[PDB]
Design an enzyme around this catalytic site. Structure first.
Site: not given
Ligand SMILES: O=C(O)CNC(=O)Cn1ccc2ccc(Br)cc21
Ligand SMILES: O=C(O)CNC(=O)Cn1ccc2ccc(Br)cc21
Ligand SMILES: O=C(O)CNC(=O)Cn1ccc2ccc(Br)cc21
Ligand SMILES: O=C(O)CNC(=O)Cn1ccc2ccc(Br)cc21
Ligand code: NA
Ligand code: NA
Ligand code: NA
Ligand code: NA
Ligand code: NA
Ligand code: NA
Ligand code: NA
Ligand code: NA
Lengths: 380, 380, 380, 380
Positions: A47, A99, A171, A196
């Site tokens: 982690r 978004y 972004d 994407k």
């Protein structure tokens, strides 16, 4: 040197130990210590750090000319990590058409933690200056935006943010590091839905964050280790592998975008076309000044809902699915699939007409994509 | 019927389509729609739902006798998801020695969002009743705890929580669903670091959450979809696969635990031993009433730091690493590895002496683990 | 329609059940039967068939305009499968400079099973006609070959093979289905080391076979099921994924090949250059008649061994490793790495001089590869 | 020391470089060389060697007390590799009821390469001595066999083989290294379908081979590198992971086997029962002398075909599928699923009656498997 070379040789994507020319997949959770506190190569718990995730983080850091990379389990997990740099009572400015998932996260999750959020039209940067409050700490910008591809001046947003002591965030999903590098223009933090274009093959949900700021990097690492939205090793590997072809893919996508836009502007069954390459587009000059290519997302108006449905079912090479940035070309109708909860007349107000189609251009043959879309439009 | 059977046949872990007797790995991000809104089998975007993740979620829901499962990218991501059921100004009670990562998340991340946190000794449940404020909304309990294995009465905590309108949560990592089912005792939500026993092979970092509450499930699903700490498909598959042998592993671990505890209590170089199976242990009766087996974590005192280091390096079958719940037996010194930032005299106050060793029993031969540890202790 | 489109939409690479836009990874060995003999979707045991392997097989069959695809654990396993169409006493013709692994398989493994092998210079197809014996059953052709890129007339080899009742086979690895389709020219069987260009990312060892012949397909399937050199599901998935970008990769590789060959022909420290694009190359006309592009493998002479070693260590973007067809450009010295067991004077006889360098062009920026190689050559 | 310990700590299944407590997955095909011929850790091309495959090979070598391990793409690929130690004209003895896939490989593939094969009843070892020809080079033994579990004396077969200069081979799939170690009894080569118990989770098709003979190991390595039936890295990793629990799984399977056999012998609707644990079984003494446990495969007679079909559909915990050695219990009817091509009266001759059921015991609760099968039998 040049970008296609950097995509192949930049970052650490080989194995120092065996010489393996691809990053090993460390499907592991913990690591032997030779003595209490002696980590062989810096690893102790996956982690906190995992060498496959570290490989992909070094890639995103290199590709954005940053210093620190971070890989999260999704784009929205990257975004939540960044928003968690703030405290209750802090205020964040976002571009008004950000978004949908971002808007939902901010207004339905983080406002319950006292984060205040204001949506402004950042296409005029003085809007940002007007919206600044004494409690504003973050400026969050997508450019270009979904689904109408509004462009925001990144360099001016960075200057504004620095002058008022704001963490600036971009972004950069739609442009990718291949065409637009916000950190080079003064932005504090750049992020991506690697779901994407970066992964590029519709087979990884992932987010990536890069920064050059040591203190912001330390805070991000603390947040990632404490809230635990880490990307796993197999997905990190698939991300590194997909990024190898990013330049070739984006360049093919751009050739088809230019030709498809010529077709759409000429066609009678098509009204408005939304894309930053069109010279009549708001801030086309600005986009050209901050990017050296284009996103593969285009939107355009047909007559109405059933023309859009007819279009979808007439095309042979445009696929009906969520997401963007696949090797396949994707087609969608925002008013039904992403903006359906908004009342119809505010949809019309915003430009999300019932006949607004969004396509995400893939890597099929250019002439095939032009011809297939045109023959489908000719049936309207 | 019985538990070992349920581990094999409970949940949906085969492919309805091909008949494949294992869950397919859907390394995919998006899904074809036959018409706008028509999902073939309910899937549309892998962050929202992925069929491999769905398989593992159905497994954890079945194994805890819940109705809804959720798979997160780590244990702490599961915990942050659950804490995000709260709003600023809400107050949460946690047991005083809760996991260090949990404490860090609450006090250094979520208090910046106005979550208030109080640590109480839940070994006496009336402590909970005293700590309840008008703003308390959540009660969060590990039993048994790390590293001294304090036991909390789960059923009474559930009753208290219901009477005062609190969401009750149990971190059931140490016991696993094979031995302890908090939902059966009235708890609202049960969670796990599947990084430990459930995956069982030290090769997945993951968290799992189960509930029977439809409204809590809907809120968790909203939080998971908006903050995006989802587990990927490859890790979900490895989790399902690891859970297949959970019963066999835990039973072997328990046989060795009983024998090792006999050895430790007899040995001269060992002072106090911490484990709920010992009849002198606080709330041993309570643990027996709420579980039908034991965790594989044991702690015991040797003389001092260098006896502990000697012990570690004398054993052949106890491995020095972070985490617990591996197929290997693991050994560690909390005062140096997990509680080193705490000043030494509060460490001593809490029982975290310099010679406190923690072992996580693995699945090696019982007699080998007893003999190896005893011969290593005999060198002190 | 066109090739880049066919690479994306040809074959079955989605999930009919969930709509997943990528092939699910069926990491499974066996399948539920509803009744004895009732296979839900035709699957019963993964060695016989696995749906991920089936996806990749349909891809190679589609890309070569065949009817049947087969995926093996490596290129040499594909080749051994095909050679096992023969019986003891049967005779096979191979081109004289066939791949070293192929030659080794035939002459050190299959001759112990009574397969007789003759190496002929197939650059003149009448050589084949002379070498035909009454016992010859197979004609096996690479074009172009390694490392001097000799071209063989595929269409004439097919005619010869049909007239004399021979199974014709082409190892199409170097050209890939994107540029050369032997089945379209009358060849019975086409095969590939998908380890190279098809996978394209140096992370899968695999072989692929396509045919249009039902009876040959049935015999291949029997051999694959009985000798069991099958490709696993994870590698099949990575193959499908890599093939998505084959066209973009090969076209970039070809742009760099043209420019690099201009550079090499102009440079003083370079003597002979071997590549089918050069108009002086033997059977350049033939290659152009049977392919519409070029392989990314080039060979060229420098002065001697230490000029070659200097070259290797002076380049920044050419990597020293085995294999060809990576995203990275690869460099090697056959006389030391692939032909070192051959005595030096037969090496010289064959053209494998001590200064013969082989490069496999990757997808880096063209100008970077030209400039890097030229500056390295300028140090000689 | 003891077997369950050796399963966890024997072999090399950690990462020397990072300390990762599980073997990294080297999803890679080739490796950087620092100088021509300088391999960093011995790797240069993944077909020749891959570090994940090397990890699993070291595991099988350790578990069988051999020196060399080899991992193939399937059990039958392991078997073909071993048979390829022979030349045309060589002769091999196999036990008369050897696995159907083995028989098919030998008689329909390798006899076309001049390998001669004789099937003998090896339950009396003097049968072997009678069948030895001057051309016999290999003795190939399964014990116990499918589906009637005939036992062959391994130690005497080894002595016979050594005296007559034969390579001795044992297919040890049914017993696994946990219970039977042929190399310890003088056998030259031991092999496994790791598809069954070793992987143990029905999610890998794989074969494993171990030997202590340096020259046989060198020939096997040459054959594996030239015919290329190698196991991939992901499947090797899943094999290592599955083998971790082999001992726990086999011991649970054995507890259920004993109880199920008591039930079957008592039940009126059951005639003959085939398993080496029954004291009336041929060579029960021999099996006990060479193994310290039992296989999980049992066969038993019901009345006829439709009693068998009724049985299958009445059970809740016995699954109808191919293969054996899953975590699930599996049920099958050889006369319909594995011996259906044999004419009915030779089936009856061999003992493959229409009511012969084969079960592969899994790891469900013992009492559940006994009760479920008994209640299903009670409906006959
Ligand atoms: N920006 C560039 O293109 C130059 N550049 C910056 C970092 C870096 C790493 C590798 C390579 Br290759 C090129 C690089
Ligand atoms: N608790 C139990 O043990 C009984 N039980 C409850 C749900 C369930 C699913 C499968 C099987 Br098998 C048994 C089950
Ligand atoms: N050769 C071609 O290019 C045409 N062609 C032949 C098969 C086939 C499948 C999909 C697509 Br798209 C095109 C195809
Ligand atoms: N046979 C045995 O059980 C002893 N033995 C032989 C090799 C070996 C490796 C590791 C361990 Br632990 C035990 C081992
Ligand atoms: Na830029
Ligand atoms: Na800066
Ligand atoms: Na319980
Ligand atoms: Na309840
Ligand atoms: Na062609
Ligand atoms: Na033909
Ligand atoms: Na033995
Ligand atoms: Na021996």
């Amino acid at each position: 040197s040049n970008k296609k070379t950097k995509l192949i040789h930049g970052g650490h994507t080989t194995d120092d130990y065996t010489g393996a020319v691809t990053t090993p997949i460390y499907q592991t959770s913990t690591y032997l210590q030779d003595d209490i506190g002696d980590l062989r190569q810096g690893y102790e718990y996956s982690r906190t750090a995992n060498p496959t995730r570290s490989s992909v983080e070094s890639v995103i850091a290199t590709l954005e000319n940053g210093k620190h990379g971070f890989a999260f389990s999704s784009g929205v997990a990257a975004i939540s990590a960044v928003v968690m740099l703030l405290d209750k009572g802090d205020h964040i400015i976002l571009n008004s058409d950000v978004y949908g998932g971002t808007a939902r996260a901010l207004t339905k999750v983080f406002t319950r933690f006292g984060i205040e959020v204001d949506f402004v039209d950042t296409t005029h940067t003085d809007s940002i200056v007007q919206a600044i409050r004494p409690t504003t700490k973050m400026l969050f910008i997508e450019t270009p935006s979904n689904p109408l591809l509004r462009v925001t001046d990144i360099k001016k947003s960075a200057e504004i943010a620095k002058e008022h002591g704001l963490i600036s965030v971009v972004d950069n999903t739609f442009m990718t590091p291949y065409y637009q590098n916000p950190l080079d223009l003064g932005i504090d933090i750049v992020l991506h839905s690697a779901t994407k274009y970066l992964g590029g093959h519709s087979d990884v949900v992932a987010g990536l964050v890069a920064t050059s700021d040591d203190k912001l990097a330390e805070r991000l690492a603390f947040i990632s280790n404490s809230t635990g939205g880490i990307l796993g090793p197999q997905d990190s590997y698939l991300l590194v592998r997909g990024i190898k072809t990013l330049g070739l893919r984006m360049e093919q996508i751009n050739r088809s975008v230019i030709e498809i836009i010529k077709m759409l502007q000429a066609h009678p069954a098509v009204q408005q076309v939304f894309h930053p390459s069109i010279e009549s587009h708001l801030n086309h000059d600005v986009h050209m000044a901050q990017a050296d290519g284009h996103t593969g997302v285009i939107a355009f108006e047909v007559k109405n809902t059933e023309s859009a449905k007819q279009l979808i079912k007439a095309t042979s090479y445009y696929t009906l699915a969520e997401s963007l940035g696949a090797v396949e070309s994707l087609i969608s109708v925002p008013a039904l699939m992403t903006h359906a909860s908004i009342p119809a007349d505010i949809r019309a107000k915003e430009g999300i007409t019932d006949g607004l189609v969004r396509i995400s251009v893939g890597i099929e043959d250019t002439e095939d994509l032009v011809d297939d879309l045109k023959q489908a439009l000719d049936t309207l």
